[model samples]
Target: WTDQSFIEMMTPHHQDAIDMAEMALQKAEHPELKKLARNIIRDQEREIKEMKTWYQQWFKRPVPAMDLDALATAQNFDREFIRQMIPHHQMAVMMASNLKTNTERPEMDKLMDDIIRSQSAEIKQMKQWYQNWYG
Candidate 1:
């Protein structure tokens, strides 16, 4: 995908994460899970803002709307968060990986690298947490 396409796709992807995190804040009972949800909201919101700014500046178009129907429901908060987010995080890693060879911008390179590193680690952690808690 072009840089514009990448940004457009990722904008909603990040928003979906924020949406789930917001639900977690309202529904999660565990303190640590709630804290993690809050962190996700903060971080993803910031990143989404930055990405929208970049998209506007470069493409001169409105950011796409996120579909609320795509967000996770509040049921079974902890397990749901893990179950939903692992694949969500993995998709991000895959997107970043696909874009790695396409972007020449150092900033994009760094952002993709960070996404891969951080989300990969989170995916692993969530998997372990799922096994420990639900298995």
Candidate 2:
């Protein structure tokens, strides 16, 4: 029953970071790193759109930020990209996790649980990818 304002706002924020990761992957020449980034891009982009739609339906607010061109270039290394995404995913996970403790509504709680599980899994995958590629 509660309006999910913070969660709604985070949709575009998460999407922008994922777009940055994809841009790096597409532009990267390093094979392993590129593969890892591609996976991140694929998984995160879908989650972003899903959350955006959820916000639109439940909160009655327009999902923010249509065009985000501020992406990280592949002139950087795998470590840099991984470092960047860790914090990016961390922010998302933190926000989503917060909803579990804060929200009283059943639907909202369930949605937060889903987000936490999915993002946590993706975060672990990204970390493993980093170890395999860079370590």
Candidate 3:
């Protein structure tokens, strides 16, 4: 797959995060959870915009559609958010791993590295939180 495929697929993945974060804004009661959700919304939306712009500039085509499915829900919102997001972040880390050797562009390479580093750490943290609180 080309960089186009990476951008197309990852865009929807990021959209899923944004969607879950929006749900968190409504369902999460804790101030810290709400703040984290807001940060996810802000950061992922900005990255989505950046990826779309890169897609347009590089591919000379309109950004592809990001049709994502709804996330699973649990009775507890914070636990549910963490549950949904752990796998979400893992998927991103996997995608980034796949892209590691595929890209020649320094920018894409750096982006993949950043995604792997940040999302992997978050994944570990979320898993710990889930085990502590939900297990």
Candidate 4:
């Protein structure tokens, strides 16, 4: 896929992860884990903005918009949203995984390489949060 495709897919993927991380902040009992989850939210939110900018400038597309307030209100942390977000992160992982096989551009390949490493770690963290918090 193109850099544009990666940015487009990753924008919402990152946003959903941030949403779940914020929900973890509200319910997580462990202080250290809560802090780490909050940090993930902050970092992923910033990355989402950067990704959206790349989409808009290089892909010649407007940044996608969604009603986050509505989404948050609809979420039921331990059940609905965490499960929902697991798939979101999984999608991101698959996209990053695809790049390993398909991408030829050195710059894009390096970016995806970083994404695969970082997001793989994050996927592990999120799953651990889900298991520890909900189980």
Model 4's alpha-carbon lDDT is: 0.66
What's the true lDDT of residue 62 in model 2? 63
**Pairs of residues clashing in candidate 1:** none
lDDT of each: 0.78, 0.65, 0.78, 0.66
Total backbone clashes of model 4?
A: 0
Which of 3 and 4 is ahead in TM-score? 3
Off by over 4 Å in 4: 66-87, 104-107, 125-135
Per-residue lDDT of model 1, residues 1-135, tens digit only: 767788889888988888888887877767777777787788778778777887788778877662234344545668877778888999999999988889886767877887788778878877887888788
For residues 18-134, write the lDDT of model 3, one tens digit per residue.
888888788886666778778788877887888898899999998768112333345577776776788778888888888878888777888788789877877776777678777
Tell me the RMSD of model 3 versus the true structure: 2.7
For model 3, the superposed segments whose C-alpha errors exceed 4 Å read 66-73
Question: Model 1's lDDT to the true fold?
Answer: 0.78
Task: Report each candidate's C-alpha RMSD, comma-separated, in the order given.
Answer: 2.6, 4.1, 2.7, 4.0
Off by over 4 Å in 1: 66-75
Residue-by-residue lDDT tens digits, candidate 2, 63-116: 655122323433445556666767777777788787678777676676677667
